[PDB]
Amino acid sequence: QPIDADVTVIGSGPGGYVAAIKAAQLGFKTVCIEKNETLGGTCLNVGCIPSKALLNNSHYYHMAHGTDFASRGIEMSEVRLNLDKMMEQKSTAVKALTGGIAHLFKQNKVVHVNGYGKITGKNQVTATKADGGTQVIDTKNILIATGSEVTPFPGITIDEDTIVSSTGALSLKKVPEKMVVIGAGVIGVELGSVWQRLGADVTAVEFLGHVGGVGIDMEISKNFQRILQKQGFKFKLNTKVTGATKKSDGKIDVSIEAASGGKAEVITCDVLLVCIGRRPFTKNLGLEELGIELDPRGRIPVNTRFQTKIPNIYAIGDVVAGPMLAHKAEDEGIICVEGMAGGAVHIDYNCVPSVIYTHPEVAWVGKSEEQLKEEGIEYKVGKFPFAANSRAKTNADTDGMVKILGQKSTDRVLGAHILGPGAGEMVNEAALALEYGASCEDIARVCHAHPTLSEAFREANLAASFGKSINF
Amino acid sequence: PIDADVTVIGSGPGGYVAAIKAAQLGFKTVCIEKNETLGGTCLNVGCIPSKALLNNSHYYHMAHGTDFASRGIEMSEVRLNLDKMMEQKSTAVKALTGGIAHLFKQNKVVHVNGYGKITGKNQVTATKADGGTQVIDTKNILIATGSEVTPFPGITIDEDTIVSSTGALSLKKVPEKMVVIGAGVIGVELGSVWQRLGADVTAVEFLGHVGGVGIDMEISKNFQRILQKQGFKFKLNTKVTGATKKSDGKIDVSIEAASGGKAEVITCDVLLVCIGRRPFTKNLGLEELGIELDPRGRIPVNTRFQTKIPNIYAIGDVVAGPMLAHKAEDEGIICVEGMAGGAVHIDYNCVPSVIYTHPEVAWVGKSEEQLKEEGIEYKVGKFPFAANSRAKTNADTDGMVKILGQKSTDRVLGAHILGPGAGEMVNEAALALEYGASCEDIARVCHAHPTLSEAFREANLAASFGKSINF
Ligand SMILES: Cc1cc2nc3c(=O)[nH]c(=O)nc-3n(C[C@H](O)[C@H](O)[C@H](O)COP(=O)(O)OP(=O)(O)OC[C@H]3O[C@@H](n4cnc5c(N)ncnc54)[C@H](O)[C@@H]3O)c2cc1C
Ligand SMILES: Cc1cc2nc3c(=O)[nH]c(=O)nc-3n(C[C@H](O)[C@H](O)[C@H](O)COP(=O)(O)OP(=O)(O)OC[C@H]3O[C@@H](n4cnc5c(N)ncnc54)[C@H](O)[C@@H]3O)c2cc1C
C-alpha cells in the first residue's frame, strides 16, 4: 500500500498547508503529513490564532469593565468575567479554522497522511501512526515544513499548569493572582497583557533593555513600554531569571538578578510563563542519515530555491532562517512550490512586517533607526501622533504615532513603525509601499480617505518628505 | 484695513488645509469663516460627529446585544445613556475644532470671523455678525465655501421632528419609528446609528440599490441584505410624494413606486430628509463678479482649480468631483501648491469612498457596471471574510473583498470591500491604484498573518491566478 506523489509536505503548519494547497493547484500530486490530531500547526492550534482571540476578548472586557464604555453612554450594572465562555469563543474559532484546512485539502486533492514522517530515502517518506501504523510515500520531491517548539529553560521544567509555556498560558483555568513572564518578546508581551487585562498582577522580567524583542525600533519600544506600564503591566528589564522552584504552599519563587553583576532578589507568583523563545523542530526527520547537517541554531540551511544540500529536498518556515512568523512561512511555502514548477523564487525578509496585537497595537516593516545607523545609511524622519489624527480622536483612542524613515536623498521609504490603533492592518499598506520602492512623497500624495487612521501614515511620510505634516 | 497673498473663504476640509499649506509655502495667508467654529461641515455637522455616533452605537450594540456575552463579558443590565453618548461625540468635535485653531495659529494663518464676499477682484470684505467689517486685499482668492443640505420642496426641515443630517446627529430622544428619505451613504450611516439604539428604521430610496452613486451593485445588494437582517428596513424604487406633520405629533410620509402607483403611507416620529447636498455660494458676489455657475450650482474651474478670473480659485464641495472631505483636502493642497508654481494633477478615479457602518463598505476605482459600460475585458477575484483568519478569530465575519483586474495587464481596475476594516483597507488599494499595480503585484506582497488585509491579498490572488489559497 505505498502511495506515490510529486510533492510530500512534512508539516501542516502555515508553511506546510499553504504549500500543499499551492502545489496541488499548480498540478502536483500532493501529500501533506501531520503528526498532530489536527492540521494547522503551531499558529492555528496554540499560537497566533488562539492568542489573538484572547487578546481581542480581553481588550473588550477591559472597555466594558473599565471606564471606556461608561464614557460613551453604555451603562452596565456589574461587568463579570466568565473565563469559561471566553475560552469557548477561542476554541470555537480554532475548531472552525482547523476544519477549514481539512476541507481545503479535500477541495484541492491534497492527500492528508496522519503520522510522524521520517525521510527514509532520497525519494521516500515513511509516516508512522501512534498505533504503530505505517504508510510509505515514494515522492519526487520532499518539502520539510516541520516548524518549531518552545525553547526550554534549563532548570525550570514546564508542567503547563503553574509553570507554563505559551500553550498553557492560553488555557489557564482561572485568572492568576500574580503572574510573572520570563522574557519580554512579542509573545510574552501579548499573553502578559491578556491576563493583566483580566485582573492578574503581571510582571515581565527581561534580560535586555527594551521590550518587544529583536528588530523593534527602540523609540517605538520605549514609548510602547511606557504605555503598557501605565496600564499596569510591570517590567523588570536588564534582569536575568536564574531559576525557579515551587513552594510547598503552592506559589512559585523565581530567583532573579541584574543582567550583569547580581542584585540577586526573589519574587513570588501564582503562575510562571516561560517565554524565552522557540527553536526549529527537526526531531527524527532523518536528516543526519541524508547528510543534511543543521546550522548552529538548529536550522536547515537552504539555497535561494529553498533547496537543502539534496536538491529535491526543500525546507521552508520556522525551521529555516528568517523571522519566525506565520506569513513568512506561508510565503516561503508558496514561492518554493512555484520554483519546483520552474518560476522565479523571491523574498526579501526586509519587507516581512511584524505585528504586536496588544492595544495599542505595534507594527513595522523595513528598517529600524538602529539598523540604519549600524548600516551607515543617511536618513530623515517623519512623525505623526495619533492624537492629531481625526478617526483616532473621534474614536477616543489616540494612543501612539506613525514614524517614517526615508533615505536622505532618494526620499525612499526605508522603514515604517506604527505604535497605536490599527497598526496591525496599517503595516500592510507600508509593506506595499516598500515593495514598489515608494518614496515619502509618493505616499504623501496618495489620496487617503477621511477620516481614517491611515491618514497618520500619510502625514508622517509627508513630514519626512516636505518637512511638516498638515495636522501637526 | 488688512492685506495678504492668499485669502481663503471657508474653514472646511478644503479650506483649512489649503490655508495651512499656503502658509507653509511662504504665503501671507488669511482664512475667512462665517461660523462659530472652524472645520466646516465635516467636523461640526458631518464626518466627525457621525463617525463618533457610529462608533458608540456599534459598541452599544455589541454590549446590549449578544456579541459580548459570547465572549465571556457577562453583564446584568445594559442601558443607553443617550446624553453621555452625545457628550463623547461633542467632546471629539470640540477638541478637533480647537486643534484647527492651534494649527492656524502655529502656521501663522490669520483667522477672520465673518461672512465673506468677493467685493473686488483682489479684495474680499468680511461682514461680521455685529455689522462691523474687515476688508482684505489679496493677490489670490480661494473659494472653499462647500455645501449645504439640499431641501425637498414641500417638506420643511425644522430640525426638531423633521430633520436633516444636522438635526439627526443631535436627536434628544431615540425615535420609536424613523423614516429616512434617501439611501445614500449619509442616510444609511445615520439610519444605522438610530436603528442600533432602538428605533424602527425604514429608508425610502428612489433608486434600486443602497449606498449612493458609484458603489458596486453586487456589493450594494449584499450590503443591504446584511443591514436588513440587522433590522434596517428598506423600500427601494419608491418615490416619496410628500409628508405632513399631524396634530398628534406623528408624521405621515406619502409614497408610491418610482414607476408610479402603489400609493402607500408611512407614519413615524422623526423624518430625516437626506436627499443629498449641493454647493454653497449664496451672496458671495459671483452673481455680480461674472462667475457663472453650472446647472448644478458648481463653480467651473480648470485643471489648476481657477475660475474665469485667473486669480480666483475654487476647490472642494463647491466644485465638480465626488463631494468628500479627502477630495476637498487634496484639491486644496494641490491648488495652493499650484499657486506657488508646481504642477497640479488629480485623478478622481483614485479617490476612495467609505461607508462607516458595521460592516463597513469601501471602494476605490471602478465598479463592474462601469467596466461593462466601457467594454473593458476584466477578471474578478472574490474572497469572503469568513475564510479570513483574523475575521474568524474576531468572530466578525460578514462580507467579502472583491477585485476587478484588466484581463490583459492584470492591472487592478477596482477594489471593493464589504466587511470589517474596509475603511482602512481601501487605502492599501488607493496606493496600488496610484502605481498602476497588478493583482499579482499585491498577491506577492507579504501581508501580516493574521490580518484582515489578507482577504484583500487573497482576492487579488484569485483575480490574478484564478484561485485563492484559503477559499
Ligand atoms: C503564542 C504564540 C503566538 C504567536 N503569534 C504569532 C503572530 O501573531 N503572528 C505570526 O506571524 N506568528 C506568530 N507566532 C509564530 C507562528 O505560529 C509560527 O511562525 C508559524 O507557525 C511557523 O509556521 P511553520 O509552518 O513553519 O511551523 P509550525 O506551524 O510550528 O509547524 C508545522 C507542523 O509541523 C508538524 N511536524 C513537525 N515535525 C513533524 C514530523 N516529523 N512529521 C509530521 N509532522 C511534523 C508539527 O506538528 C506542526 O503542526 C506565534 C507563536 C506562538 C507560540
Ligand atoms: C452627516 C454627514 C456625514 C459625512 N461623512 C463623510 C465621510 O465619512 N467622509 C467624507 O469624506 N465626507 C463626509 N461628508 C462630507 C464632507 O463633510 C464634505 O465633503 C466636506 O466638508 C467638504 O469640504 P469643504 O471644505 O469643501 O466644505 P464645507 O466643510 O462644507 O464648508 C467649508 C466652510 O465654508 C464656510 N463658508 C461658506 N460660505 C462662506 C462665506 N461666504 N464666508 C465665510 N465662510 C463661508 C462654511 O460655513 C463652512 O464651515 C459628510 C457630510 C455630512 C453632512
Ligand SMILES: NC(=O)c1ccc[n+]([C@@H]2O[C@H](COP(=O)([O-])OP(=O)(O)OC[C@H]3O[C@@H](n4cnc5c(N)ncnc54)[C@H](O)[C@@H]3O)[C@@H](O)[C@H]2O)c1
Ligand atoms: N539559538 C536560537 O534558537 C535562537 C537565536 C536567536 C533567536 N531565536 C528565535 O527568534 C525568535 C524571535 O526572537 P525574540 O528575541 O523575539 O524571542 P522571544 O520573543 O521569545 O523573546 C524571548 C526573550 O527572553 C529573554 N530572556 C531569555 N532568557 C532570559 C532570562 N533568563 N531572564 C530574562 N529574560 C530572558 C530574551 O532576551 C528574549 O528577549 C524567537 O522564536 C527566538 O527563539 C532563536
